[PDB]
Amino acid sequence: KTVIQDTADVYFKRKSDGKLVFTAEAQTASFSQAISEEKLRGGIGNKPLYILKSEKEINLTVKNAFFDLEWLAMTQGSERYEVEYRTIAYNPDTEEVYSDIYIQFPNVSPSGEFEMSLENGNALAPEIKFEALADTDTDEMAVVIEASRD
Amino acid sequence: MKTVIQDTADVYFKRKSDGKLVFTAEAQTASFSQAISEEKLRGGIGNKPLYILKSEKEINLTVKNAFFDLEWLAMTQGSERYEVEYRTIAYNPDTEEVYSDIYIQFPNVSPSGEFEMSLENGNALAPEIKFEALADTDTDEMAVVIEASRD
Amino acid sequence: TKDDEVIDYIYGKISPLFALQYIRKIDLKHVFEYDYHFEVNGTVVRHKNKGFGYMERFFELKESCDERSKLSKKQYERFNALFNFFEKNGVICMAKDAGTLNTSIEINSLAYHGKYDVMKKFIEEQSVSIEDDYKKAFFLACLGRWEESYDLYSNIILNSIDESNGCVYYLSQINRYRIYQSITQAVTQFNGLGLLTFGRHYKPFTDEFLARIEREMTNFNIDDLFNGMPFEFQKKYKILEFLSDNQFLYDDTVKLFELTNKVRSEMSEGSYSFGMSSDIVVLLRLYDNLRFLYENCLWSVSFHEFHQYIRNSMSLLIEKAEYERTRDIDELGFSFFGKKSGFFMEYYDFVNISRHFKIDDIKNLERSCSIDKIRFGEQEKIEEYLVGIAEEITKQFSANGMNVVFYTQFISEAKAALYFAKYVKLSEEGLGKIVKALLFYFPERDLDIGKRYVWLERLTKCNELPKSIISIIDDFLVLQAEKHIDQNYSEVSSNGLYSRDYGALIKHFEKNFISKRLSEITLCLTQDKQKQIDFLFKLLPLLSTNAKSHLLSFKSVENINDLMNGIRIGLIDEFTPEHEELIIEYLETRKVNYIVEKEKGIQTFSSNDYMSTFGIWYFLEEINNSKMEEFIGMDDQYDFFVDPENFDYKKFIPSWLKNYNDKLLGKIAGNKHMKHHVIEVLKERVKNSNDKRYLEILMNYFI
Amino acid sequence: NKFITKDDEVIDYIYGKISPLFALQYIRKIDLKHVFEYDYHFEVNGTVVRHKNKGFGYMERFFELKESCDERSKLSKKQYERFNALFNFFEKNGVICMAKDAGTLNTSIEINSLAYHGKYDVMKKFIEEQSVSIEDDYKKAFFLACLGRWEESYDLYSNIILNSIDESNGCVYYLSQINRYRIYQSITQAVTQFNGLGLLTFGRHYKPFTDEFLARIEREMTNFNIDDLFNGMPFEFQKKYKILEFLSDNQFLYDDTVKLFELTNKVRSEMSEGSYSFGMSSDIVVLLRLYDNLRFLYENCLWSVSFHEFHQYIRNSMSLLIEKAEYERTRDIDELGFSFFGKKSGFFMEYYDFVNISRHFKIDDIKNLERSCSIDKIRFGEQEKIEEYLVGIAEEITKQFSANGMNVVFYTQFISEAKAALYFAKYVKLSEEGLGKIVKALLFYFPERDLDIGKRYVWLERLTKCNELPKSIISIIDDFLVLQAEKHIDQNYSEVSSNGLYSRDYGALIKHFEKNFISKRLSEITLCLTQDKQKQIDFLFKLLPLLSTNAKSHLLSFKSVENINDLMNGIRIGLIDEFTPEHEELIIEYLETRKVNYIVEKEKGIQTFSSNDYMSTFGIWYFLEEINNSKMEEFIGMDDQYDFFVDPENFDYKKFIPSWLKNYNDKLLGKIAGNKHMKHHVIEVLKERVKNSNDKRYLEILMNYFI
């Protein structure tokens, strides 16, 4: 009858400068990696000599009520939105905080459904959905930093 | 007339060794289940026999409209294990004409339902009850089916 | 401003809640005029606060040390009371300072634990307070004594007018309405169906009592009960509106529906959840609802809607736990969740599943969850609960006095508990008690012979078989043998198992049994007891050599029923021409019957269908007689077994393969004429259905 | 009700108890028990049974009068008129006859609201007309609300609420007040969500409402408490229209949700047992209840139809029904499984079902249904009306986004329906003109914020699944590519995507369907371009097969290959046949740089990922014989798949991910199954995964290839 719960931490940041938008927590935090492929290409040209058809899409989700008070007001009155996750992991044998986990995305795009008009007064909770976006150059999306040097 | 499509059924119980027609007739829900199962209860034998099979086998029933009777109910107010007979009507898809009636009879039936609804809001009657088809060691039992439409 | 100005308001709008033993955390939003949110994990979040934060100051003071002493002695006592009350309900800190939380849940009601004997001691005791009378009435109501509970409720509601406490009056009135409803439904179901289910007419309530309760509450409505309460009770106790009607279970059920949809979407998508998952919320809410409804002596716990809610919550939790163990590796799992902390099922979960489920629901769980892999902890309390159940059953059904009303409310719990005892480990003496209770004194009306044997094997699955259980089974089997002496004592069963399986279960583990009692019984058997010789004929392997020699005389020689019975024990090892002749005679009679049925348009399905084992014998060269080929067209299984090249495979029902013994399935994959077709139906069934047995058959033997 | 003994008195009683209910167009059947004080019970089928009656069966008397033509003539002319009005009301509502005599019944479902059918132009024309009555004003208010003009909707509702008491109408006042409250709630949530996240989403601070309107809406109804609206207003309404009580509180979407939850539990339990149900199944009740609810909330002009709670209800009901249909498609029977109900409706998805799925679903839930059920096997009907609906969506989008006019308020409501419709139109056989219009609307005028260059390709390809590619669609995609080429002059454009595909895949898709597609306009664009402006070099080289022979020679003189992206793309287009040692040297250089930055990373200890692992493709090069160099082996230990492919002998199978096999081609899986070194472990891991999971692709891969 005793249940142990954990937390996380989320940090947005727009590119070309260091404007910081962040959430204190990520309750839902539904990280969803998926892979799906279908039949493709005509098959002509004899050898295909290539098997790298890949469709990797990454979806995120955050929960908060903190939209930052410094520039939200100034804009109130398309340069990427790169995110940096941060969390902690512990060694099961010792149950001590020894590792810090950093997850980084260099390019994201906010895609929220503007149809959350509910019927009763809710607990705010403006859930925000994000999608990993990639250019055509190289690398991008998944980068993970691992602590626990000792 | 757009898209609903409905049908109907019928249920008749009986008291064995007597002509007492005391039960419901309609079977609104009328779910009917078959299940054959086996396990490792024969996990080991002396080998070189011939077989036993087994298959357990058991069939369930449940009907609900109530209003059993008032005469036979009265005479019971003051354990043949009972028998049931089903009567359903099927139509030919090509012509959609009433031509076939199905006769289904189970010689033995064991009434055993959870004797506690205890629902918070009073319902519109319909005390759904279930049945279990008992089987003996003699022969046959289970189901006897007759098919109409000798046209 | 001043700290005293903060703590006085909290006492002012919290202190009246001391009459209740518990309040659920999410209900505190009502007592503060929707000003804050109090999550199921015990944290604090502001919603409509615009003035001073009277909420945050209390936790600030609780964390601080020197500020505690800066108040007056009366205010220090007030802070102590507020601290104690908050700690009892699990409100720990606020969101900003929230760290790691370990919520504590503890049910202390004697009703949950099923200690009926302690209830019996408590009831025979002179009460000294109104709360004691309320507890005694609830204890009687759970004990089945539905008649005196009404009188004690009337007395407590009559004596509670002249006291400044309306909480007892309100709760007692709700309970009275509930017991009246239960009595009405019970008598209706009795007079409707118990004359048929129980075999007789049972009238536990006199007509005067029903007439009086009807006269008293013909004109009572539950929706307006709160509005009739005085304005002070309207104001202080706003936390108790949601209990007046049945809208409370509606509001919990809709939230469970949303959570279930979210969990199912999560499972289908194959994502991960950080922070608080959607199942911990369901578990916490379920436990809060349980302890709310139990500690405060609310009678709503014995109704169908509560059972449905707890059933659905537990089913969702177990399904999520099963899916958690079989998730794919991907490339993120090990770093975040390594050394998987599986969902342990403790004593509380076992009691919940046992009490609130029926057999069909547990079977449905077993068909879609490998429940044997799940760990089972805290086994001593499980043993104590099971032994108490067995002793209560023995006491109830040994004396002449059976409480039918309590019988309807208790038999399901004992049934489910003895079923679920398969996955837990048992002590030797406790195993003896449980087996004795299941075999001897459990009623036959609700539990048949085949069901009894299946339950005995289920309980045997996890624990070995010592000598005490063998002696117990031997005693019951001797009792059944001696009871089978009247000319009309036929036996019935739902799975067709009977006493032969009891003999087989004895023989499977221990091999050299003698059973002196049965030898004594059979030595004195003279003649003219046909069913008595037939009963222990199938019991031959458990008999002595001298008893066997005695029984071989006046033996039921070769009748088809007797042939199958004798070949199921090993008396016949190889066929003789007489056996083939009898098989042919049975087949010819069946063919004439089929001609008659076709003339009458009748089709039959029997559990005593010998029509199928004949093809099995023919295919494995048991019988070399070659006149079977003329009976083609009687049954599909015969045609499939005897003529593999002539049967039309379209009639091949794929449910047949489940019943085949493993050596047939080895032999079924040897002939060319039955390999090209069975493979395709196997693939189709494994692709279009989720039955794992079909996949096993396709994988291990055919491939 | 204890004085009802005469037939004419029976008719008078029923008229007195039904007459107030002629103002509404339609009423829910199952709520008629509230009117008659719980006396009877109207089953969703249309029959009736006795529940709380101890006297004369007045409903039974009316029913037996209905079937007796002679007795219908035994009444006064006034009584004949009352009986005729009762008959018309009972036929429109849907009730047919009694339960004890009910035979085969065919209940009718029909929706007439113009808001449901998505006919926006006709609705605008109706709005601009001059009003006649107060009910007309109610209709125009609803239509304005659905059109995104929430500013004037409040004004019209205020006018009708001010003029309501003059005509002594009761229903209009109640309904207008409720709609006022919902429209206020929606305006407040819209502006709050705007200021919250639309600043990041749309890129600007959109203010479509003036501040004084917000001030007024805040002032008028600060202390509006909705639960008291029924109770506080005069008694004649409290005694006549007791059926309309539930619209006030929120329980009107709680009771139905709980009942659907119970029925879903029952259906799921019956699915896992194999039970056969006679009579009215547990799934027909869901369909009937949903259709009655839709008729009530759409015919009678209510604004509770644009909320999340109702969408959840429709989603769950439809998902349960489709699950039941898929299960009923495939199961086993011994002899009598087909004997009972020896036919099937097959869940023929009609026009109303398609509108329901389009309006109240998102992409994620449709994807969940695709994963679980097999929608392709379900039949489709009236392919003409669905074509009209889709063409209407396309024309609305083209009209809205073609001119400078954009209504953000309408954009919040229309785009989800547009997306759902264009996604789900994959399974329905389309025409020629409709296909052309839909393709044009998708390709040109659909906003790039809600649909990047990635998902457009997915949606177009899925619309080509059940159809062909006629000349018109090829020409219009060529037009899209030419617009892209004209656009490919910006110095910063990057063509970001969330799927990994770009304009080259559109051309590849065309060339798959029709190969001899020497492009015409792109050829001129390539010819007119010189060596100075080299931003278009990437876009042109990605799209090499769509060019002329003279353009081929010009690009041969143009362009260059120096880094590994050029090599990989040339491999993607099939230009490169083999490798001279120069490309091998480049690959070796990249691998060497990988080792040095790898030792640096190991010194600091990060790990990484980097996603598009070119070294997995390099291991594929090595295994599949096309590259046979021996220096490749010096880089063992980079990735798990790298060691799995390059040196299977010294590769531990613990580090094998089962999800790699999803991305394996026919020939590659055949080659890996043809080997013997690693085969047995591959079968063992695939079997372990198939046994305990529900991924059909895993079973198919295990069966077809390795067996």
Coordinates of N, CA, C and O in Angstrom, one line a residue, chain D residues 505-575:
Chain D
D505 N 10.5 12.5 -53.1 CA 9.6 11.4 -53.0 C 8.3 11.6 -53.8 O 7.7 10.6 -54.2
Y506 N 7.8 12.8 -53.9 CA 6.7 13.0 -54.8 C 7.0 12.6 -56.2 O 6.2 11.9 -56.9
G507 N 8.2 13.0 -56.7 CA 8.6 12.6 -58.1 C 8.8 11.1 -58.2 O 8.5 10.5 -59.2
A508 N 9.4 10.5 -57.2 CA 9.5 9.0 -57.2 C 8.2 8.3 -57.2 O 8.0 7.3 -57.9
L509 N 7.2 8.9 -56.4 CA 5.9 8.3 -56.4 C 5.2 8.4 -57.8 O 4.6 7.5 -58.3
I510 N 5.4 9.5 -58.5 CA 4.9 9.6 -59.9 C 5.6 8.6 -60.8 O 4.9 7.9 -61.6
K511 N 6.9 8.5 -60.7 CA 7.6 7.6 -61.6 C 7.3 6.2 -61.4 O 7.4 5.4 -62.3
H512 N 6.9 5.8 -60.1 CA 6.5 4.5 -59.9 C 5.2 4.2 -60.7 O 5.0 3.1 -61.3
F513 N 4.2 5.1 -60.7 CA 3.0 4.9 -61.4 C 3.1 5.1 -62.9 O 2.5 4.4 -63.7
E514 N 4.0 6.1 -63.3 CA 4.2 6.3 -64.8 C 5.6 6.7 -64.9 O 6.1 7.7 -64.3
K515 N 6.4 6.0 -65.7 CA 7.8 6.1 -65.8 C 8.3 7.2 -66.8 O 9.1 8.0 -66.5
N516 N 7.7 7.1 -68.0 CA 8.2 8.0 -69.1 C 7.6 9.4 -68.8 O 6.7 9.9 -69.5
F517 N 8.3 10.0 -67.8 CA 7.9 11.3 -67.4 C 9.0 12.3 -67.5 O 9.5 12.9 -66.5
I518 N 9.6 12.4 -68.7 CA 10.6 13.5 -68.9 C 9.8 14.8 -68.6 O 8.9 15.1 -69.3
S519 N 10.3 15.5 -67.6 CA 9.6 16.8 -67.2 C 9.9 17.9 -68.2 O 10.9 17.8 -69.0
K520 N 9.0 18.9 -68.2 CA 9.1 20.0 -69.2 C 9.5 21.3 -68.6 O 10.5 21.9 -68.9
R521 N 8.8 21.7 -67.6 CA 9.1 23.0 -67.0 C 10.4 23.0 -66.1 O 11.2 23.9 -66.1
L522 N 10.5 21.9 -65.4 CA 11.7 21.7 -64.6 C 13.0 21.7 -65.5 O 14.0 22.2 -65.0
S523 N 12.8 21.2 -66.7 CA 14.0 21.2 -67.6 C 14.4 22.6 -67.9 O 15.6 23.0 -68.0
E524 N 13.4 23.5 -68.2 CA 13.7 24.9 -68.5 C 14.3 25.6 -67.3 O 15.3 26.4 -67.4
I525 N 13.8 25.3 -66.1 CA 14.3 25.9 -64.9 C 15.8 25.5 -64.7 O 16.7 26.3 -64.4
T526 N 16.1 24.2 -64.9 CA 17.5 23.7 -64.8 C 18.4 24.4 -65.8 O 19.5 24.8 -65.5
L527 N 17.9 24.5 -67.1 CA 18.7 25.0 -68.1 C 19.0 26.5 -67.9 O 20.2 27.0 -68.1
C528 N 18.0 27.3 -67.4 CA 18.3 28.7 -67.2 C 19.2 29.0 -66.0 O 19.6 30.1 -65.7
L529 N 19.5 28.0 -65.2 CA 20.3 28.1 -64.0 C 21.7 27.9 -64.2 O 22.1 26.9 -65.0
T530 N 22.6 28.7 -63.6 CA 24.0 28.7 -63.9 C 24.8 28.3 -62.6 O 24.2 28.0 -61.6
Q531 N 26.1 28.3 -62.7 CA 26.9 27.8 -61.6 C 27.0 28.7 -60.4 O 27.4 28.3 -59.3
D532 N 26.6 30.0 -60.6 CA 26.7 31.0 -59.5 C 25.8 30.6 -58.3 O 26.2 30.6 -57.2
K533 N 24.5 30.4 -58.7 CA 23.5 30.2 -57.7 C 23.4 28.6 -57.5 O 22.9 27.9 -58.3
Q534 N 23.9 28.2 -56.4 CA 24.1 26.7 -56.1 C 23.2 26.2 -55.0 O 23.3 25.1 -54.6
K535 N 22.2 27.1 -54.5 CA 21.3 26.6 -53.5 C 20.4 25.5 -54.2 O 20.0 24.5 -53.5
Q536 N 20.0 25.7 -55.4 CA 19.1 24.8 -56.1 C 19.8 23.5 -56.5 O 19.2 22.6 -57.0
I537 N 21.1 23.4 -56.3 CA 21.9 22.2 -56.7 C 21.3 21.0 -56.0 O 21.1 20.0 -56.6
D538 N 21.1 21.1 -54.7 CA 20.5 20.0 -53.9 C 19.2 19.6 -54.4 O 18.9 18.4 -54.6
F539 N 18.3 20.6 -54.6 CA 16.9 20.2 -55.0 C 16.9 19.6 -56.4 O 16.1 18.7 -56.6
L540 N 17.7 20.1 -57.3 CA 17.7 19.6 -58.6 C 18.3 18.2 -58.6 O 17.8 17.3 -59.3
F541 N 19.4 18.0 -57.8 CA 20.1 16.7 -57.8 C 19.2 15.6 -57.2 O 19.3 14.4 -57.5
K542 N 18.4 16.0 -56.1 CA 17.5 15.0 -55.5 C 16.5 14.5 -56.5 O 16.0 13.4 -56.4
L543 N 16.2 15.3 -57.6 CA 15.1 15.1 -58.5 C 15.6 14.8 -59.9 O 15.0 15.3 -60.9
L544 N 16.8 14.1 -60.0 CA 17.4 13.9 -61.2 C 16.6 13.1 -62.3 O 16.6 13.5 -63.4
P545 N 15.8 12.1 -61.9 CA 15.2 11.3 -63.0 C 14.1 12.1 -63.7 O 13.8 11.7 -64.9
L546 N 13.6 13.2 -63.2 CA 12.6 14.0 -63.9 C 13.4 15.2 -64.6 O 13.4 16.3 -64.1
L547 N 14.0 14.9 -65.7 CA 14.7 15.8 -66.4 C 14.9 15.4 -67.9 O 14.5 14.2 -68.2
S548 N 15.3 16.2 -68.7 CA 15.6 15.9 -70.1 C 17.0 15.4 -70.4 O 17.9 15.5 -69.5
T549 N 17.2 14.8 -71.6 CA 18.5 14.3 -71.9 C 19.5 15.4 -72.0 O 20.6 15.3 -71.5
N550 N 19.1 16.5 -72.6 CA 20.0 17.7 -72.6 C 20.2 18.2 -71.2 O 21.3 18.6 -70.8
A551 N 19.1 18.2 -70.4 CA 19.2 18.5 -69.0 C 20.1 17.5 -68.3 O 20.9 17.9 -67.4
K552 N 20.0 16.2 -68.7 CA 20.9 15.2 -68.1 C 22.4 15.6 -68.4 O 23.2 15.6 -67.4
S553 N 22.7 16.0 -69.6 CA 24.1 16.3 -69.9 C 24.5 17.6 -69.2 O 25.6 17.7 -68.7
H554 N 23.6 18.6 -69.1 CA 23.9 19.8 -68.4 C 24.2 19.5 -66.9 O 25.1 20.1 -66.3
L555 N 23.4 18.7 -66.3 CA 23.7 18.3 -64.9 C 24.9 17.5 -64.7 O 25.6 17.5 -63.7
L556 N 25.2 16.7 -65.7 CA 26.5 15.9 -65.7 C 27.7 16.9 -65.7 O 28.6 16.7 -64.9
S557 N 27.6 18.0 -66.5 CA 28.7 19.0 -66.4 C 28.6 19.8 -65.1 O 29.6 20.3 -64.6
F558 N 27.4 19.9 -64.6 CA 27.1 20.7 -63.4 C 27.3 19.7 -62.2 O 27.7 18.6 -62.4
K559 N 27.1 20.2 -61.0 CA 27.0 19.4 -59.8 C 28.4 18.8 -59.4 O 29.3 18.8 -60.2
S560 N 28.5 18.2 -58.2 CA 29.8 17.5 -57.8 C 29.4 16.5 -56.7 O 28.4 16.6 -56.1
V561 N 30.3 15.6 -56.5 CA 30.3 14.6 -55.5 C 31.6 14.6 -54.7 O 32.6 14.2 -55.2
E562 N 31.5 15.1 -53.4 CA 32.7 15.2 -52.6 C 32.5 14.6 -51.2 O 33.4 14.0 -50.6
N563 N 31.3 14.8 -50.6 CA 31.0 14.3 -49.3 C 30.0 13.1 -49.4 O 29.7 12.7 -50.5
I564 N 29.7 12.6 -48.3 CA 29.0 11.3 -48.3 C 27.5 11.4 -48.5 O 26.8 10.5 -48.9
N565 N 26.9 12.6 -48.3 CA 25.5 12.8 -48.7 C 25.3 12.7 -50.2 O 24.3 12.1 -50.6
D566 N 26.2 13.3 -51.0 CA 26.0 13.2 -52.4 C 26.1 11.7 -52.9 O 25.3 11.3 -53.7
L567 N 27.0 10.9 -52.3 CA 27.1 9.5 -52.6 C 25.8 8.8 -52.2 O 25.3 8.0 -53.0
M568 N 25.3 9.0 -51.0 CA 24.1 8.3 -50.6 C 22.9 8.7 -51.4 O 22.1 7.8 -51.7
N569 N 22.8 9.9 -51.8 CA 21.7 10.3 -52.7 C 21.8 9.7 -54.1 O 20.8 9.2 -54.6
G570 N 23.0 9.7 -54.6 CA 23.2 9.1 -55.9 C 22.9 7.6 -55.9 O 22.4 7.1 -56.9
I571 N 23.2 7.0 -54.8 CA 22.7 5.6 -54.5 C 21.2 5.5 -54.5 O 20.6 4.6 -54.9
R572 N 20.6 6.5 -53.8 CA 19.1 6.6 -53.7 C 18.4 6.7 -55.0 O 17.3 6.1 -55.2
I573 N 19.0 7.3 -56.0 CA 18.4 7.5 -57.3 C 18.8 6.5 -58.3 O 18.3 6.4 -59.5
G574 N 19.8 5.6 -57.9 CA 20.2 4.5 -58.8 C 21.2 4.9 -59.8 O 21.6 4.1 -60.7
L575 N 21.8 6.1 -59.8 CA 22.8 6.6 -60.7 C 24.1 5.7 -60.6 O 24.7 5.3 -61.6

